[model samples]
Target chain A: SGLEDKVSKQLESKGIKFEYEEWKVPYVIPASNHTYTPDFLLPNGIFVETKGLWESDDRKKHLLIREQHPELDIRIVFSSSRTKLYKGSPTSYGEFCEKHGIKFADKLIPAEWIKEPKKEVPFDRLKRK
Target chain B: SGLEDKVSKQLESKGIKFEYEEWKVPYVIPASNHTYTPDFLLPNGIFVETKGLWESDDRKKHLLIREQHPELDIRIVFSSSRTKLYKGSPTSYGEFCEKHGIKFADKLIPAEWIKEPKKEVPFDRLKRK
Candidate 1:
């Protein structure tokens, strides 16, 4: 909560226009249906998910979202990149992203990410398909 | 190189007493013997290892050192906590440390860490044993 607010301020300070959790992309964890509303969507179409404590369910949901929707450009912004994914777990939030081929940043989103040229949304691709 | 220099400056600015690579802690890599000269030894006997790029050799050495010398309070200060452990590797330097129960910080050494009360050196512990 505090982390997301800090990120929001960071983006605002830079005058970077972004949509906060505006899009809900649907996916399924087995038979159950789920929707992932990303924390921030840059104008360039990068979905940024800000995490404080990465719970087991959140990790599982993100992994499934990645597997099912490979077209989406989702990235993570961690409060502390060193934070362990779970208690007694060997993985950090960043490591989990790396393992799953997800791009990520620590504390705040990188400037390069904000400056990237706008790209087509995967939802449009889904509609076309 | 640059990361350590930055850390040094941070410590200097805070007036924290520290020794730069003053002790050579010996350990082994199976048949080979090696030494880890930590970046900074805080007045509290905490070994601060500053890393720009966490290379395979460095990671391996640290793991071995941790295994062989568990009493040493060896902590890491990473240039970027999100930096992958290796190309195509699922782990980050932070993750590796977390996995193995090693303490770490991003960019600069944390204030709380520098403020820790002085503890006995592990090398001294070795001598006493």
Candidate 2:
């Protein structure tokens, strides 16, 4: 809940006005299951999520959703990526996202992630079998 | 992951040996769904998790599982409680766990939680509907 306010503040400080959860993008792979709503949608079409808790179930769900919708441009800003799931393992929130192919950042939103164009596969690489 | 190592280190320093993910506790609430494997199980039969991330979906699942399996005892040790999900909105992992009635500590396991008896609600409290 308090997440929106921080992101909003950071955006304001940087003079970036963005829409918050203003769009719901629907998708289907083999079947229709659910719609994915993004947190912040910049004017340039970049999606942002302010993350604090990246628990196990959510991580699994994100993997499935991302696999189904490769075109979606969703980036995450975590409260603290250094936080551990337990105490000993070597994976942080950032590492988890990296392993899962989900883009993520620490704390405040990164200006660069917003300015970049959505990541779409190179058209020359796609050919049906 | 690094979590296990950290928990292991803490336990070692405290001279407490525990079984890590050595047991699976199966649960079913209306229908059979899955088994929950806990992180640490002490000789005293207390289970523990060293947590860095506490995402939304996992919290919901815990609530459901707890409702169905009240006999299970699971506690958590977080890396830091001050880390925010986003910013502005005021909710931390500790606050969330407290709201859900889950016992948790910061970083290393707390001596009290380790030594305490498994949290089983008084039988008198669960009488006829």
Candidate 3:
């Protein structure tokens, strides 16, 4: 099995039900002249995204996606949430996620969120309920 | 007329007939998991793609496209052909285009190529004549 298979195996042992590339959220970013697809989707409509390096363009694309589809519950799991966005920048991954109204975890899926299987609350836009 | 309209008028005056977004060469970049639509399609099948910036990701995507579908004749027109790829890269836009086997003109479509309306030649890979 590939190294990535280990992650799913670990989840299976814990009785966590998830699918890989089972769904797609298609979005067109006119700026890029191309479409975009977010990563994984859970049974409850929440998405689990795995990002190794959330670069500047990636961040901007995600923000645009979030703006266009605020209803999507895309929770992020970063390789290291404490990594600075850029050199000499005070903004850490977690802080960036907090600032942009995204829910993110450091390396593993948060036990609570997965266990409940509910929509992510406290969006960046205050008008959202 | 909009600034973009001016460009189209210029082409029309030059006796070139082209259609905007008239054709779709649907390609799925597995790395990106998105479809890309090349900009304009001419009657002869050559595509006119406009790129304002030739950044790292854009260049990589174009290379992938060319590699995957060597038969495509997607010529490029850059906002500024002299622009460097990055702050201190030795390569200019023209050199980059040349290296990757893409036909490019500065801001205007080249008179010679548009006159003939032929498929772009000198692909990077030479196995096909």
Candidate 4:
């Protein structure tokens, strides 16, 4: 939550127009229905999620979402990229994202992400999936 | 690491005598041999492990140690007792410890731990296992 607030402030300071949790993307986790709300959505149709303390469930959920919704351009902003997924885990948050073909940043949203060209977003269609 | 320093300072201010990572307790993890070096050993023979980020490997290792070395009186000091074991999970650090019969404290070592009376600790024999 703290990370989300910080990202919001950063977006505002940079005069970046973005939607915060404006849409929920439907996902599945076996035996239950689920939806993931992106922390910030850029005009260019990029969905950014901020994470502080990444737990096992969060990691699993993201992996599932990535697999299920390959059309979605979802990215992450982590509190610390160096943090291991788990103690014995060889993969850090950043490494895990890279290995899984997910785009990510550490501490704050990247300038490149903010500067991306605006594009029309099919919000309703994305949620329909 | 920051949490461990704070705890060390707290113990010093309270005039408690303790050993910091003075010994390693051996345990098995299926594929390889491993040893757990506790963060602190109180004069009363309690092993205090301070954890800022409780990763998955750490949790598994502790659980194994608890099962293998039932004679050891081990405990934990977490940065936040309310932190969930992982996102999407119902259990918090404190709850996990409670469920597993492990004593735990938030942010710092408890007064009860510091004021615990000294006892003869068979450190060499404990690690020999």
Residue-pair clashes per candidate, as listed? 0, 22, 0, 0
Question: lDDT at B13 for candidate 1?
Answer: 70
Runs off by more than 4 Å, candidate 2? A1-32, A118-129, B1-129
| TM-scores of chain B alone in all candidate structures, in the order given | 0.68, 0.59, 0.63, 0.70
Put down candidate 1 lDDT per residue, B1-129, tens digits, no spaces.
343454445445755443443212111112434444664555676777667777886776777676666667778877678888778988887888889888998766676876678788745333210
lDDT of 2 at B100: 83
Off by over 4 Å in 1: A1-30, A125-129, B1-129
Candidate 1's DockQ is 0.01
Q: Note the residue pairs that clash in candidate 3.
A: none
User: What's the DockQ for every one of the candidates?
Assistant: 0.01, 0.01, 0.01, 0.01
TM-score of chain A of each: 0.69, 0.60, 0.63, 0.68
| Full-model lDDT for every candidate | 0.63, 0.55, 0.59, 0.65
lDDT per residue (tens digit) for residues A47-121 in model 3: 666677779977876776677667767678777799999999999988989999999876655556545555553
Worst 10 residues of 2 chain B by lDDT: B22-31
Output DockQ, candidate 2: 0.01
- RMSD per prediction, one decimal? 28.0, 24.9, 27.0, 25.7
Give the candidate number with the greatest lDDT. Answer: 4
Q: Could you tell me which 10 consecutive residues in candidate 3 chain A have the lowest summed lDDT? A: A21-30
Candidate 1 residue-wise lDDT, A83-107, digit = tens: 8877898888778788878898876
RMSD of 1: 28.0
Model 2, residue A87: what's the lDDT?
66
Per-residue lDDT over B50-81 for candidate 3, one digit per residue giving the tens place of the 0 to 100 score: 67777897787777666666666777877778
